[PDB]
Design a protein around this ligand. Sequence first.
Ligand SMILES: O=C(N[C@H](CO)[C@H](O)c1ccc([N+](=O)[O-])cc1)C(Cl)Cl
Lengths: 122, 56, 115, 119, 229
Amino acid sequence: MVSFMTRLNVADNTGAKQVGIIKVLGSTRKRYAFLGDVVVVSVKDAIPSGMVKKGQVLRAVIVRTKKGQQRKDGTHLKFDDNACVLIKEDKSPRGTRIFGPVARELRERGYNKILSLAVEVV
Amino acid sequence: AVQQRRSSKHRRDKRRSHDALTAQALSVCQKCGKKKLFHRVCSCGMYGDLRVKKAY
Amino acid sequence: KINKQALIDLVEQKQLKAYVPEFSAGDEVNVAIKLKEKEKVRIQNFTGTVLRRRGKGISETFIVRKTTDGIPIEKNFQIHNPNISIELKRRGKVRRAYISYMRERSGKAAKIKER
Amino acid sequence: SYINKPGKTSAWRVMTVRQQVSAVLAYGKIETTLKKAKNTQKRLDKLITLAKVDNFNNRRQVKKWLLNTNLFDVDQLMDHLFSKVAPKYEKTPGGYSRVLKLGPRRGDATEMAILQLTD
Amino acid sequence: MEIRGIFGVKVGMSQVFTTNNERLPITVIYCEPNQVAGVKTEAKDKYSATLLSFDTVENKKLNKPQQGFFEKNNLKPTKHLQEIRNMTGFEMGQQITPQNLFQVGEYVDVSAISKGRGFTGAIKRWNFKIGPLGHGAGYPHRFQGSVQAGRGGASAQRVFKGKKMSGHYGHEKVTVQNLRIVGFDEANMLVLVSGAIAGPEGGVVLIRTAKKKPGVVKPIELAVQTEKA
RNA sequence: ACCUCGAUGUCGACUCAUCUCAUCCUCGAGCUGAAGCAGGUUCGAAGGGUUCGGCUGUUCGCCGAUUAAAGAGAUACGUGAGUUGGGUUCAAACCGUCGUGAGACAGGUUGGUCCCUAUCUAUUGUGCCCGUAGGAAGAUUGAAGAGUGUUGCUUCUAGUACGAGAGGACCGAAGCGAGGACACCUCUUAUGCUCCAGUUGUAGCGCCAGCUGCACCGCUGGGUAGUAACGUGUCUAUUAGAUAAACGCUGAAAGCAUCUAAGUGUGAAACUAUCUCAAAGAUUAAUCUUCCCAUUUCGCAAGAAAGUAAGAGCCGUCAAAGACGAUGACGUUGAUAGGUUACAGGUGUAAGCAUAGUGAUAUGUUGAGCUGAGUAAUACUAAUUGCUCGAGGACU
RNA sequence: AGCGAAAUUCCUAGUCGGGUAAAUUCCGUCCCGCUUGAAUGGUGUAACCAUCUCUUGACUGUCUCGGCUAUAGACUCGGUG
RNA sequence: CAAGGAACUCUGCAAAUUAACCCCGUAAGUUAGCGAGAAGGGGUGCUUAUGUAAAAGUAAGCCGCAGUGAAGAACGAGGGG
Ligand SMILES: O=C(N[C@H](CO)[C@H](O)c1ccc([N+](=O)[O-])cc1)C(Cl)Cl
């Protein structure tokens, strides 16, 4: 699905355009990062507006996987490109509004502030 | 690689102990007196009381 | 004795439905899905286009594509699944039982509706 | 390990089975190897059971597998199939051909066998 | 131990649904009433076991000694004969239906001979990574792995006993435990058990009470479809 | 300077490792300048793991981000009869230095051949013969064994015990993970070469239409069964016994005190099994059930020739197996394989025809036609009116 | 004179800035240049190099992580060896 | 060959992506010749009519996932020696 050193889109108003993976979190050698799993990442190129520019590193939550995973019910979610959402340390986001739909699986880990500020959910 | 000490005649004999060919089973045709193969036709043709080939 | 290999269908009769509409690749469809996260079941509507329909007697499944904010969404549904309902609103002309071209084209390429 | 014969190919197998079934339909008795005879028996049976209708569609459909022989041309075998082969089988389903096991040769000592039609 | 076992033939895999909107793939096993052949008395042979037979066939199709043995005890002529340790309380000449052993959702284990694989390398047998396919390969580039534990006459000359090597795979008796069976069919004589089931499609499969969790139940009841004309 | 010059192929990387404990982590416990979290140190413990990248030819070393940590080591500083060659280091040439010279300098600098078809041992799988004092078919027991042995996060008890605030548990319960292993392929993708449809060029089937050959399978889009993972389950747990360190009673040698001398206890991923796998070639050859048996009797009674009569083997159709052998089912008393019929799944409107257009084409006849290996019946075809070994149990 | 840790710099993994998450390699500078240096040439240079070196856009099994089919061998059988 | 797209490796080695024709459009630098086919894009099928002598080109219509349908035909931009 999502592997080490992966560039994906930015789906929130943080100023960045491309996000690159730094390392998957959890235990060592996880080798993958699925929906809802937090991952340390960095920015690649950003517009002058925004609270973050080139050079800094953050922790983000993956919200879009192209391969997709099968839910416990039987509905296997799919997406075309890959997106992510940025936070600072806490569950609160670093951006006001989020572009694009977000999966329901975040409810299994919290992040209700992210879903409450979305335009469409699964 | 190759052998480092020569193989004795005993070694080759024990190796070829399995060389003996099996005794192939035979069968007697029901109309042409001969010892043919098994499940197979003889030189005449009647694999059973039924033919297939002309003469050979 | 012996086995029939049709017992797969024989036992599967416990979970089945005979009210599923017919649709292959282009008919405009809608799915109503029920979610259970509170005391009240939440109802979500999902309109869009068909991608594939496949199954033998229980593996009958389909794929629905929609668009939102210029981003496409593919969702896979099991036909025989509680609290999932399907309906057809506008069927259309198709040339293949399975399509895969929508993964790179969106908009200005809608399926022409047949007679 | 370079420069290798093209060897046996899927297209080669199709050509071989077409040639063998055409030859069998031409003469009726063929001495060959056991494996190829067993492989071509399926196509022989399919062609014979398809020939039982004598309509344009199936006759077009059997042109794919057919091929001319030394003694009879393409149209010759095409007419022969529905003239003196298909009418001979109308009550017997399948089993229009059979194989018997010949002896092994001496040059290569392969497995040789004869293939014939139904009496 | 309360271990009890029944044989059957696993015939295919097909998922069924239930309440809570949860997905669970299921496998279908054609069951058959197994006849008791004997019981080893615990005091008589120092171990307790129950021997049964199944897959009945034509009486004359079996060999003479087994036919005579079944004639002596009036046991139905069968093709398969096997026993299970510590199975207690089942006298001879009795027929067993699968409803006497397991509840609707208690823990189960399933055993069967693994499906065949033929000869295979250590790559497909011990998860050994493939050698480098780029920047120079050498005509060997898919290899069993180095084995040498030393060079000389002090820690060498020996290849380790039973180290992973490219060998036979499959066609061996395996077992998977902690299984929750979900479907009974006495009117049709079939069972449906959750999870993947080992064994080739059409082989002999043995269903027993798992020793992992000694009989703890948690039912799973099916949910009937509600949408209809 | 002790074996090697009649050649024991050197650094590092990849894969594969195995072993010790001076323990990196989990675990047990003591002491504390240990209020509690987190700590510092001594002893026990080898069960498992011990990250990914940038610079780097490198091991290092530095750094970035995570984790339970990023263990110290050992084996011709393991692993070229497994891969390469980035280099000390070959023949070409640069510069710097040295030399009056050819030239030299771990001074740096660009390029640059890595041979070997397996004899014995060892190991991984797997067969034939013989033996187990009758023969054969089955089912067992356990002799000695092998593998599996990692933890995290969230919540509750509980903002409780603790500490003045800050801050924040031991002990337990539940859910969710990652890693690895065992399997399986219904659901998701991967492949799916006599499967389906579109399709260019070219040459044929005389020609139109339609089909074939060839152009990697001609290309493309899918896709049967089986094989596969990224997909689905389960496993990592639990308890019992004896113990390391540690913790104790009663009790004296030593009127006291005191875990030890006796008796009697607590107590760790270590250990024995509980889990899984195989196992009577366990010669120390085990147990049980069933089936076959009694032709006086003839050479030097020597169990000598009538000598299986149960079964097994030869050959064949085959795959649930499969390099070969085996294994498993079946040989006209039959469903073992092929063919036929029907259905499944896939492909998606076969070909001809009529209509509309003028013309490529569209519509209806058409949920049609097609389809290797899927499934159930079918003796239509192929497994024959063939051959060999094989019973009176030396004695208890 | 010019140039300068450059193919020349041993202490050097010299300072700083950059490009990256991290830069012994890279580029512009700084200069006790241990031993730079102007015909054994210095400096700059348009085009070119099966030249060396470094960043980077599309691209892909190089890789995370392996799998499937096909042939010809490899395996059995027959002839030579 | 799914997703990632050089994270492998001393080094994007190998392999893959741009390929044929026609039409737009093309920079630094310079010895003014070049760089340049730079870079970056667009159209190619069949039928009808317009069309020169053929092909061009044009407009309309039709088919499909794609239309030099396969085959054979440059991956580039930078700074340094
Ligand atoms: O000479 C060789 N090996 C010699 C044999 O006497 C010996 O093994 C050796 C190996 C390495 C070495 N060295 O690296 O200095 C010296 C001797 C090989 Cl290079 Cl052919």
